[PDB]
A paper describes a structure:
Dimethylsulfoxonium propionate ([name]) is a recently identified and abundant marine organosulfur compound with roles in oxidative stress protection, global carbon and sulfur cycling and, as shown here, potentially in osmotolerance. Here we report [name] cleavage mechanisms in diverse heterotrophic bacteria, fungi and phototrophic algae not previously known to have this activity, and highlight the unappreciated importance of this process in marine sediment environments. These diverse organisms, including Roseobacter, SAR11 bacteria and Emiliania huxleyi, utilized their dimethylsulfoniopropionate lyase ‘Ddd’ or ‘Alma’ enzymes to cleave [name] via similar catalytic mechanisms to those for dimethylsulfoniopropionate. Like dddY, cloned dddL, dddQ, dddW, [name] and dddU conferred [name] lyase activity even with equimolar DMSP present, which was not surprising considering the similar structures of DMSP and [name], and that these DMSP lyases have cupin domains and similar catalytic mechanisms.
In addition to the coordination bond between Mn2+ and [name], a hydrogen bond between Tyr122 and [name] helped locate the carboxyl group of [name] in the [name] active site, potentially explaining why the Tyr122 substitution reduced [name] lyase activity by >90%. The positively charged dimethylsulfoxonium moiety of [name] was located exactly where DMSP was in the [name]–DMSP complex and was stabilized via cation–π interactions to the side chains of several aromatic residues, including Tyr21, Trp26, Phe108, Trp110 and Phe117, which, except for Tyr21, also perfectly superposed onto the [name]–DMSP complex. The Tyr21 side chain moved ~1 Å away from [name] compared with that of DMSP, providing a wider substrate-binding pocket to accommodate the [name] dimethylsulfoxonium moiety, which is larger than the sulfonium of DMSP. Structural analysis also highlighted Tyr64 and Tyr122 as the probable [name] [name] cleavage catalytic residues, although the distance between the Tyr64 hydroxyl and the C-alpha of [name] was >4 Å. When [name] binds to [name], it displaces the water molecule and forms a new coordination bond with Mn2+. Subsequently, the catalytic residue Tyr64 attacks the Cα–H proton of [name], forming a Cα carbanion.
Author numbering:
A (entry chain B), B (entry chain A): 1 to 126
Write the structure that this text describes.
Amino acid sequence: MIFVKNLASVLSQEWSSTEKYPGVRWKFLIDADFDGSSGLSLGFAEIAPGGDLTLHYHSPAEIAVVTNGKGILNKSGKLETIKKGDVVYIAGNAEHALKNNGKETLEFYWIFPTDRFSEVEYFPAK
Amino acid sequence: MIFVKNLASVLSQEWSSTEKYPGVRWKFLIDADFDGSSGLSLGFAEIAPGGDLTLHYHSPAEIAVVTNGKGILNKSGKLETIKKGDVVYIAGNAEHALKNNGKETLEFYWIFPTDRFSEVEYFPAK
Ligand SMILES: C[S+](C)(=O)CCC(=O)O
Ligand SMILES: C[S+](C)(=O)CCC(=O)O
Ligand SMILES: [Mn+2]
Ligand SMILES: [Mn+2]
């Protein structure tokens, strides 16, 4: 199994979102629930201006690849700005958040060492 | 740990290359041999015009995130063009290759579900 995905390829998948996290939306691009892939899973997320992926944690390690815009990464209390061209490593169960305070949409891929997103349990930090 | 890394952040690290992959060079941005991260590892690769990452396989699944240029992905014998904005899933042990026959550099990140790149044993294929 080898395959290529982009936003055009997942046009017929609806965006995921929740009232719990205003301004945040996501799609699944490499994911066992859609593709039968395994070992790694990847999604594409957008954070609108003012949106906040609030402080949370989850057991798998995570990489984010920032593809557009800029934001403020909350590294368990220590803030650092991120932007297009950055990659982010987040250790498993490390508390992190991401806020968009710019003009552009903050867009990024996330990657988990899991077969799929839906088996990752998200916990709010507080 | 949580950290951020971009090409500028690894200026200190010389490009890696190998004779078997002409016109291919890479750096390690998230890697236990460099960072003490764990669970996922990520590098950045450039394939110069004419360069060829020849047909090979390795046991871990792999994701590629194409950030610039165009390339010809060999999917175990079936070709597909990839370009900026694409992501690629390569199942563990699936045979794959990536050629650049364009005029601009083909740039991508790769991600493995390993702590470090040196945990990935590469095998040549057909
Ligand atoms: C934008 S998502 C799909 O909630 C996942 C983002 C994250 O885990 O940091
Ligand atoms: C650029 S590398 C790390 O030599 C090979 C990348 C790959 O496994 O496809
Ligand atoms: Mn997260
Ligand atoms: Mn490979």
